[PDB]
Each structure stands twice: as structure tokens, then as C-alpha cells.
Symmetry: D3
């Protein structure tokens, strides 16, 4: 079992190459120093066929992340949008996770970015949402907005998420809750966080936490459903006494939270607002409703 | 021009594979999330032959960095020590830079480290030292000791070093001076920093900076040459009014600093203490001296 | 003495005599501060003695216990009824009420395993309100949101408040202004802080306690057509404000005439402060039938 | 099972009161606001008899802590020392943990005429698992870190309870800067290449047990360094242990799932643990000033 | 030279000759930085030379003196009339005005007891390619002022050492201006200007916390609302500025100066953006009287 | 009563000028932006004559401060040393406080083409507070941040924070303030370095965010010469509360004992034994009663 050994094609520098041929040299610069940007995109089976959810937003963020790191993607947004569709279409996938990733090649081994060639790959492949997960606050502090570029989804910056996730798992939990350098709640290991108190939705301001696309989708869905939503600084004990809490992310969708640091969240099961938003988001991404058709890009 | 199209061998998981055949899949976990550890080792031409300078300290630190990241190196320290010498000998190198690197394989794409295979790679290949360099203080804050593991030499953590080095170069300088989150001088982008005032050597405490092996080596040489050395917190303007300043690193060796942020350092020239320590370090690594033979391991 | 009084104290389900409400000297909360409490007021209304926002104080008491992982052995309706009994059975026309939850004297370690949860409720019975008070910014930094649970009203957390208040008093002032770890204005020693500048009300965003009296002022400010903005405030921003005042359960609405020697506006209670102070007293005294749910008759 | 329903006496404002009768009113000021200071002292059985270890240092620190909180103890240091000796003697304790505690009475209920009460109560592995606390240790300008105050232990209770719920035994505290500060209630030490490293007394406790280890390390020829320590510097240390009055020397074999050294009690930890025990038990006549006979 | 020139300067209730507007070298504010000042512009309008937002600059001047416990020995009406006098008496068509409140040379200690307060108002006549093509900005390695170390709401004299250090750094790095970050790492302001960005048609500016409540900033908020632009005050990171569609500085002396590059990252297309051009044109039409609105903001001289 | 209407001379840009003639234009750049460096120097009455204490260290720190601020002093150290002695000699001062000050002139007005001017003024020099102890209140203003202001340079505009803190300590009933760094640890007084004694050992904050005071450096020398153990480390405010002794060091404050901090009595509330010996040693040194360290006393005539 391996992520490298499987059938299909991977979009690699403009061409569709076989899956096991999509390799890079062991002295690849991003492999050793972390300078790279990537995306996480999902394709869902809809009544209209396989559709990618908010492809343009993920492609724009990819270019934004590369622009932050001074990495010139040798392609336009149209080609990357088309190549991301091709990554799912040319594999005949009914539903997939998509990993567009921009990295520096194996041209040089120094810290200077000059001389390094920019490579782009796009790989696509096929109770947590029900009752709720267990969360433990991480002892590792979340990224500092002047140490790592928090608006960029960069490869090397995910060590902190991995350390925190391993700590949460070794502590008996399913996910970690990250605090910013100021001590306020920021996000999960790879998800944004929302809480509900007295029918009002609260979520941390986009300061140190990543401007999640699933987060933005729930902000739009909440307004359309008439929910009052407040962006403000949230403390860890404010999460303890919330009626509801859930995570948002491309991979996690809307995942309810039932316990943080041993504190039961409300009644300890998926709350009414969480279920309404979770259902609305799933119907949106799966094409169960004609609403927001501009957010669904058919792959074929 | 490329770092992959090369003639030679690279130590790849217990086997000496051809340089062009030392590849990994493009969905390598460390490639996407930066979770990995590496070292930077130099080999010098001594009167006794090609020797690796302080091989034991670099292998010990490599295992420390892996131990910090909960990465299990599937080889003993002796096996890594023997394989490091093999990367220099089997390539017929008179003087070499060695890059041992430990990374997670292309087994999974989730943030959980479970199921990931640990691979080990050891690749080896062949005026500023005498003049001194221009330095500019980085606007990017150095790593935070509770966000990144500052004692580990991890791959993904060097995004901050590349951002800083590019800023320094775009500003017309040669290197950046990093400040910790408290505003005190920490290190260079890839080197440790030292200053001299009234014949006393000062260097930042091993706090947010990497415990450099060249740093620790200079501590030994400074004591052998009768220089009082004090480890304390240093401010940027204390560097401005120092009599001397220099950088230490495996690649940088002993590099004098003639100017910081436009402020000339002393006489704007390699001062007496820096030159004596620089010659003492070069005589040590090239075997021109006699003592510390335990720090020079023959490669053949 | 606060122990030698005539009356009753609601103690673990029953009304005991005031001097009989004792606890052992090795009580866990007494040695480690792990406990939560509330400050509630009862006012005389045309309908009789009524507790102001009893439900909000009881809900916050349970929230503070939930934060500290303390299981209150009573439901919210029992605590609500007990709080009314603390005022009624003491024959109080207007009262301050102190519900408090603490760990008993079953152990002496830092672990909470085996500790019994006890609940007590004790209820007992002008120029500052009109002329304003002197405030000196505290040299003690206010609580850190990840060091202490700032949303919980915990016993041991008030050491910081006592240090700041005594510092302000020895400095010739009446109250202290707390700054958060980042240097922004947080609150007073035991009150929230508001400022007025060009007819707009500004208050720090919630390292400060989400005060119930602060919440009523938001409601009263909107009812009286006042624009209110929640944002980070600096100490010098207070110096140049037109008005400033504190808000708390025990202090109600206390104007601020001077901060750090800087005169605030005209050096006395301002217009907006007067109307909010008037609106708050009219609300708690039942002078207006509005927000009748916020006045629970003690009966 | 309760800490109140016990036999014995408790020193309570100058006199010896029966254990069950040593009570205070439920509106005690320290109970509601945390304004109080305390000490943890141990008595050990020595060949000369039951002896309190460093009674003078704990009593001095108790008056220091009170002084920090502007609390005037209504007794001199000699009276407190003698009362501490009596708390062990009059209970017929061969070895005891002693809890002197100073607190404000139930005179007022405001935040500003409070009476100061004093009580003194006395009663009778290869390494532990440690998890770093997600709670930050006390800030040196928010709470008085040199004073051993009652209300400041909420942070310790939250961290210890977090470590236990996570499957560990003790917590490791980080200061607001992210550097290793201490354990839940104990100082922390690490050993790397025969050298002892302990966090510089920043947000630290200035522990008396820590101060004795400095002396015992120097007498056993161990170089000791006080500096800032990071959490991952603990991961790669050869040894690690906690020091406290009630914990003495507790070895640390694992921090955040990282095995410390060989995962067992190390040589330096063993030598310092035996030296501390031989010191407090009076095995040798060394540091006799640090042992005060109870009788 | 700013001293050897003809003209008059308002000096403590009297108009003295420009070369005679002197103070002793042991002046307290000169040595310890305790003083407050303003930056005011006058423009040519169809009604004549008019000061832009004279009331807002005088009010803030008194606020800054109040923060520093400095008593201005004059009323706001007298300072308004003196600011107009510094422009009218000098026969200036368009000028920059420097009202400055400082402590005299009464004592040399750090205590303010005994120091007399002086008020000076000087006005003198007034880069155009940068105004239309954008400037190069480099983030400052010097951290912006801390809200509990210096009084950031006051426009104080000594607090501008930090601005000078950062401007010198940016210039030595090849750029025209510095971008300042607060102690927490978020974007605060330029060296002497407030900063704005545009992303998907929405204007973003740092919340008034560690930066100065700029009057030009307050004017742009009004001009943005009148043009239907959604404006959001929030914390901004340096890399959020990298990916912004537009960016520009605001200040009395800088007007609306677009930003084309930050830390080597091209800002959008690398030139003045559409939203910036509309606000810049609106600001010039406002201060020069091309529009009739906001007659309060143009005080004829 | 004023610091300008006095008889005597002031060294002003290479020449001595009459005291009342030592003026600068009111648009002086340092006057408006605080960018300038200065020193505080003392001349004492010694058996060999009026002598400046550590003239070289104060002149070297002035050039260090100007080097940090990128200010080019148009004069050399030898000229400044000679001018500093002239400022005392030519005024016939038996003892004096000297204020060497480097500042930008009135050439420009933006944040270039600025001329550097130098002035050195000297004037003749609380005794009950010198032998009994002062009251100290911890300042609510945070001390300077090592990356916001240049804490090793003695710059003009940076002393706003000292004035804000000193006024607070006085309005609270005290004589001096105790400053805490942005991390909460003890840094210094408003303009003095702070020392504490506990069990016969001297503790003082490490040269971190506080000023590397020359008087502090002399005490480290004198403490070593008296066999005292001295430790540099991070000190909390409550560590000062429980110290046996505490005092301030500075050029103007010399050695000032501290009897009370935040209402906490320091030890016995009077000048401790260690403070008295170090105060005696410092006064004997600067006044020439001890002939040791002859290079630290530079005769004026």
C-alpha cells in the first residue's frame, strides 16, 4: 500500500503523465526547504455529473499563495482551472480529492530562489460528521503572522499542524484546537472553527487562521439562511460554554464538535444550527439543489 | 544546469543508487508538508586525506532532530556515520558538502504520520570570507520556540530563512540578521552571529536560534585562544556599536560582517579577533593544526 | 464583621443561620482558589423587591462552573429559587447577592478527584455617582486569556484585581484601569469601562469579562439612540474622550472624571453618561414596565 | 473520607485547636478572592529524631510571600517556626507534610479592615509520563510569581487535570514566551552530556528544593547552568526530573510521547535523588543547619 | 534651508519674522521630545486659498497636548485664526502648515512642573510621478510603536524617531516608503501615512489601534462611502497586502499615493488601480474646491 | 526664572557663544521629530581641581548613539572632550552638570540634506533623599521595546516615556518610577539603573532592554573591588519587594537608596549596609577623595 502505486494520470508540467511516472529527484528544493504552495480541492458526484466545488476560488488562492512566496507559476489561471478539471476527468473519477501543488525543482541546493525552476502538479484520487468529535487544545502555538505567511497555504508551514494533530491523537482526541500567539482561539489543525451561543454563530476573525474557503461558504450560507454571524476574538473557555461547535474544511466538510478539553459542548451531540448548516453545505457541494451553480464546475 | 542530472551515487535507504535514479514520487509527504529533518556537513582536504569535520556531532544532531519530530530513523548512528563517509568516498570527492536528509515517503497524504515510511538520503557534492559581507536586519521575525521546534533542523522551517535571505538580497545586502519574537538578535538566515566588544566575544543564547556546530566549535577555539566569551541577549543597536561581528556555519565557515543596516561595524573590516578565529577554524577543518583529530574522520 | 450577622445563608440546599454557615479551614477552594461565584443585585420596584436579570446570573454561574469542570449538584431552577430565597427569607428591600460554588475539604492535592462541590448564597443590604471618580491606570497587567479563564468568574483570579485596586488607592485615586497583555484598555478592577467621543460610545471588545451590566448598557444605548462601537481602546484614547464611566453589578454606572491626571471632558459626569445612568436605574427600579423579564419578583 | 474529620490539632491563631473544630466562616475573604499565601514543608525521621527540612527557609519565604501581597502576619518568624515544630510534635507524627497558610478573615467583602489569620496543619518510580500544558504559565506582571499564593494554583489545577485526561501523570508549563518554565507544582531539571540544566528563574517558583539541588549538584561535582529551555531541548536531553517539597525528585521518562534518554531513571537523577534523601533523613551530619528537630 | 528665508511665523500670539522665530538651544522639547505638532495643507480653490479640514487638525492638536498634559495657552478659535494668519500673511497660494506646541527652555529636568508652553505655526509653499505610477514599499524591520510605551493617539514630536529609522531603511533598500508592523506583527501604517488595500472591490485598512487616527484616513472613509465602496476596518497581515488588487497610502503631505510593489511583490498590475484613481481624484477635487460639498472642510484664508 | 536667561557661555558648533545667544530656529528638525542624541555628564570638585568624571565614556557613548541613529557628528571625540571641558572651565563652574547634545538643524522638514549641530551647555549642580531613601511606584507605562526604539542610544525623543512615567510616580505620591520591559520584568528607573541586594549579593537587570548606564558600569567595577558578588539576571517586581536593599544609579542620581516600592517597605526601610558602602565608594571616586582610577577624572583647567 502506497500513495505512489496506483493507476491513473497526474497533470505534471503541462502534460498528463502516468501516475507512477510522476516523480521528482530526491534533491528537490521544496523537499528540503519547504518553499511551496498547495491547494485542497474536492470533486463531488452531483445529478449533473462530477463537479468541483469552487474551483476558481482554490485556483485564485493557489496563485495568491505563490505570489506571496515570489513563485511564478508558468501557467495562467485558466490553464490551472482546466488542468484541475482534467485531473479528475482524465481519471474517470466520480468523486475525488484534488491536490494542486506548486514547488521548486531540483536545480540548486542553496537558499536563494534564483535558478530554481517552478514545477506544478495536480493529483486527483477518490460518526465524525454525525455525533461529534473529541477536541483537545494544542500546546503548540499556532503560526505567527510575521514568522510564516498565514494567508499562503504553504507546504513547509504544516509541521505545526502535524505536531498539534499528533498531540491531540496521543491524548485520546480526534482533533486539536489551535491558539494564536496572543492566546485566542484560531482554528483546528487544518480546519476553521465555529461556535454557537443562543442561536448566534461566532467564529474567529481571519488574523492568524487561514481564510478557509469552506469557512467563506458557511458565512454565505449562514447569511442566506438568516443566521446572525459575528466575527470576533474567541477564547478557549468561550468555546467550553458554547451551545454548539463545529469545524469547516475542504476535507472535513462540516464536522461537529462534541467535547473540547473534557468540557461537553452543550448537550454533547450535533446541535440544530450545526445540522442545518452541515445539511446546507452537503446539499450545495453534492448539487442536491440548483442554488449556487456558479460554485460547481462540471469536470466533463 | 541541474542538481539531478549528475554523475555519481547517492545513499538511498541502505543502498548506493545512481544519482539520476535517486528519485521519489511527487506525492511525497515531506514534499507537501515539510515534515523532515536534514543536516549540513562539510568534508575538507587534510594532510591525512579527505576528512569529514565533526561527523559524530552532525549524525547525533540528525537523530536528535528526528527524535524531536517523532521520526524513527531505521538505521543506527554507526550506519549513518559509515554511509556519510561512503557518500564522499564513492564519488571521489577531495572536498565535499554532504546533505543527509530524512523524510516521510509517499505513503499517505493525511496530516497523520501513521503509516508513513521513513526514508534516509545522503547526497554529497563539491571573497566574502576575507572581505566581509553587508547585512540587513530582516523584517521577518525569527521562529518562535513554541510554534517551531528550534532545536530541530527541520526542512519546512526554512521558509522563513528563504523569505529573509531574499529580502536582504533585494535590499542590496548579502545576508539577513534575524530577530526573535521579543526583538533581540537571534542569528543569520543560515548562520549563528557573534559580536566582539572590547576584546570580549558575545553571542545570543541558544534560544530561538539553532545550536550551531560551527558555533559550538568557535566556542572551543575562542577559549583555546584566551577570549572571554559571554552568551547573553543582544539588541540590534548593540550590534551597530560592536567592534567586530561575524557569522558561523558549516557553509559560511567564519564570515566577517563589515556593515549592518548601513552602520559600519567597527572599522568596516575583518577585525583582529575575527581573523584569528577564522584562521584557527580553517586550520582546524583542513588539518593544518594538530589537535582535535577526533573531529576529522577519514573518508577512505 | 461579615460573619457575625443576623439572617440566613442558603447552604447546600437548606437555609442555615448566618453564623452557622462555616467550612473547615482546610477547604480546597480556600487553599487553591478553584471556585466560581456571582454578583447579583435586588432592587425595590413598584411590584416589590426584584432581582435584576436573575436568569443571566444563574446561567453565567453554571457557565463559570462548566469552565472549571465543577459539577454544581443543582439545576438552574433550584439555584434561581435559592437566590430568591436568599433575599426573601432575609427580609431585604434591596440586596447584593453572592452565590458561590467551591470544592469542599475532602482532599489537599491539586487533583479534583474526590472533592465535593458546595454551593452557598449570601444576600445582604453618592457623590461618586454624580461627580465621577479618579482613575489611575494599573501597573499590573490584566489577565491573559490563556493563563486564566477570563470568561469564568473565578475566585482565585481576583488577586490581580486586589493588587490593582490597592495600588490605585495608595496613589490617591478611587479605581484602577486594567490594560491587557497587549497594552490595550480592558476594564476596571471589577467593572467594565465605556468612553464617549463625539456622541459615540466605545467599549473594549470582549481579556475582559463579558459583563451582564455591560450587556444591558448595549441594550439601553440602542434604545436611547446611541451609536456604540466595540473595538480595541488605548489609554490615551480614554484621555481625550468626552465621557467615561464604569459598569458593574455593585457599581451600576459610575462616571469617570479623571484618568492618570488627565481630565475627562469637562471633569464631571457627561450627558450620555447621565442618560444611561438614569436609564439603568429606571430599568432596575421598575420605573418602566419594559424588560419586565429582567426583574424577577422575590415574593 | 474527608480532610476535616480527622484526629489531631491545628495551630490556629496562636493556639492549638482540635482538627474538627478548626473552621472558618463561608464568607472568608481569601475563600472568595484567593488573597492568601501558604507553604509546603516536610518533616523527616532522622537518627536524631523527627526533623523539619529547612524550616527557616520556608518560614522566611512565607513572610516574603505575605510581604509581596501586603499581608501583615500577626506573628514573628520565631513564633511561626516554633508553631510549625508544634504542629508536628503535638500530632505525634514521625514524618509529616506541613501546610502553613495565611489568609484574610471574614471581616469584609469588598476588594480593598480584613483580619489576617494563620493556620499550620500537619499530617502524614522509574519515571512518569509528562505532557506539555496547553495552558500558559503565569505572567510575571499579572501574578506575583515569587509569592506562593493560594489563588494562583487554578492554573496548576487546569494543567494537571489536562495532563491526566491526556493519559499522562504531570504537566510541563511554558511561560508567555514559550520557554519551559516548570511542572504543575514542581521545578524541572534536564541533563545533557553530564551537565545539569534548569530554567532560569523567570516565571519560576524559586523553589527551596530547587535551591538544595544546586548545592547537592555542586558538592557532587556537577556543572549546573541556569538558562532558557525550549520544549524540544527537553525531548533530546539525556535525563529529566521534577523537584518539589512533596515530590522530592521525580524522574521523567517521557515528554509528549518523546522518550527521554533510555526511558528510565538516569545516573545523575539517581545520584541526586539519593543525595537529597540522605540529606533530609540525616544519614550524614552534612548540612545539619537544614534539619530542625521537632522535639 | 528652513530658517534663512523671508516670511512670518505665528509665535505665541504674535507674528514674528521668519528668521527671528528662534528658541534657546536648551529648549525642553528639543532635548526630551515632549511636544505635539500637526501637518496641515492649504490649497487653491475657486474661492481662493483654503485650508483643508482646519477644525479637525486644531482639535487633534489640542487632543495631543491633552494626552501629554500640556496646556495650550490659547483657545481652539485662536489657533484656527492663527493657522489662517500663517497662510494669509505669507501671501501663499498653496502651502504646508506646521502648528507645533512645545515646552520652552524653563527647566532641564524630566518633570513638567515649571515648563512654559509655546505655540508655533509656520507655513511655506508646496513627487508627481509617484502620485500616478505607484511607489516601492519595503516592510520595516523596526517595529511600530507600542500602545503602552508611547501614546499612539497623540501626534508627538519624539515619537517620529521610529518613523525616520524605518524610512531611512526603506530608502537604503531601494524603496520609497516603509510599511510598519505593530508589536503583534500586523500591518499598521507607513512611515508617516496610513495604508489602504483593495481586494475584490472591497477597501481594507488597519483598525485604529497601533496607528495614528489620520485625518486624511478619515476623509477617505467618507469619500469611499459616497462612492459606494464597502470599507472594512480589520487587522491586516503583510502577505494580505502582497495579494491585494490595489494599495495606497494616505496622509496630509502624501495625499493619496498609490503603492505598486511591497517587498518585491507586484501589487496587482503594478500601477495605480481603478478604486485608487477614483478616491485620489475625489480627494483632489475635494481639497481644491472642484466639488462644492464639504464647505466645512475648506476654510478660506 | 528660565534656563535661557542666564550668564555664561555655551559651546555651539566649534565656538563659544553667549548663553542667551545660543539659540536655534523654531523649525529645528530635532525639535519637531526628536531625532538627536545627548549625554548627561558631571564635573566634581576634586583635590586636584574641577574634574569631569569619565569624560571618555560619555563622549564615546555620544558617538555610539549618533552611530546608531546614523547621525554624523561634524566633530571628533578629541574636540568634544575639549569642548566639554571648556563648557565647564569658561563658565568658572566648581561643579556642574554637562549636557552635550547632537541635533539636526533647520534645513529640511520631511522625514536628506539635514545639517548636524552640536551644543555643550554646563550649569552648576535632594540631599535628604540621598541618605534616607526615596519612594518608588512601579510605572504603568511599559519601558522601551528593543526593536521599537534603540535602547543602547541615548536619544532625545525617546525620553517621552521617562517623562510620562516620572509624572505618574509623582502624581501618585512617590519620587521615582520603576519601569518594566514589554515582558513584565524590571528594567530600570525613569532615568536610573536599579540594583537590589538579597543576602549580601547584588542583583541588577541584565543589559537587556534597559540603558547600559555608565554609573551602573562604575558600580559593577566598585562592587568587584569591594569583594561583592554581583549577578545579572531577569528580576521581577515582587523580587524587588522582598530584597534586603535597593538603590538607583545614574549620572544625576549618583547612588540613591530605595526604601519603599509600591507601598512595600524594602528591608528595614532605610539605607542598607551594602548601599552605604557603594554610595561611599562612588562619592569618594567622583570627588577625588580616593586617588584610584585617575583616568576617570579629567581635570577641567
Amino acid at each position: 500500500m502506497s500513495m505512489a502505486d496506483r493507476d491513473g494520470v497526474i497533470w505534471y508540467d503541462g502534460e498528463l503523465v502516468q501516475w507512477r511516472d510522476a516523480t521528482t529527484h530526491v534533491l528537490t528544493h521544496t523537499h528540503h526547504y519547504g518553499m511551496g504552495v498547495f491547494e485542497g480541492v474536492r470533486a463531488y458526484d452531483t445529478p449533473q455529473g462530477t463537479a468541483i466545488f469552487r474551483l476558481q476560488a482554490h485556483t485564485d488562492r493557489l496563485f495568491d499563495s505563490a505570489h506571496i512566496m515570489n513563485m511564478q507559476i508558468p501557467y495562467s489561471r485558466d490553464e490551472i482551472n482546466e488542468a484541475t478539471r482534467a485531473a479528475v476527468r482524465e481519471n474517470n473519477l466520480e468523486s475525488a480529492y484534488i491536490r494542486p501543488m506548486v514547488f521548486y525543482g531540483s536545480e540548486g541546493m542553496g537558499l536563494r530562489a534564483s535558478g530554481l525552476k517552478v514545477h506544478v502538479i495536480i493529483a486527483a484520487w477518490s460518526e465524525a460528521l454525525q455525533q461529534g468529535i473529541k477536541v483537545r487544545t494544542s500546546s503548540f502555538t499556532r503560526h505567527h503572522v510575521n514568522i510564516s505567511m498565514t494567508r499562503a497555504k504553504s507546504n513547509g508551514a504544516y509541521i505545526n499542524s502535524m505536531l498539534a494533530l499528533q498531540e491531540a491523537i496521543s491524548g485520546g482526541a480526534d482533533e486539536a484546537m489551535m491558539l494564536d500567539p496572543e492566546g485566542y482561539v484560531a482554528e483546528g489543525s487544518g480546519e476553521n472553527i465555529f461556535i454557537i451561543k443562543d442561536g448566534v454563530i461566532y467564529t474567529p476573525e481571519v488574523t492568524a487562521c487561514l481564510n478557509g474557503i469552506t469557512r467563506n461558504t458557511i458565512l454565505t450560507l449562514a447569511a442566506e439562511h438568516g443566521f446572525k454571524l459575528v466575527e470576533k476574538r474567541i477564547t478557549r473557555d468561550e468555546v467550553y460554554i458554547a451551545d454548539e461547535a463545529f469545524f469547516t474544511g475542504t476535507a472535513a466538510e462540516v464536522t461537529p464538535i462534541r467535547e473540547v478539553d473534557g468540557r461537553k459542548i452543550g448537550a454533547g451531540r450535533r446541535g440544530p444550527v450545526t445540522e442545518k448548516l452541515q445539511k446546507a453545505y452537503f446539499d450545495l457541494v453534492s448539487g442536491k439543489t440548483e442554488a449556487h451553480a456558479e460554485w460547481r464546475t462540471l469536470v466533463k
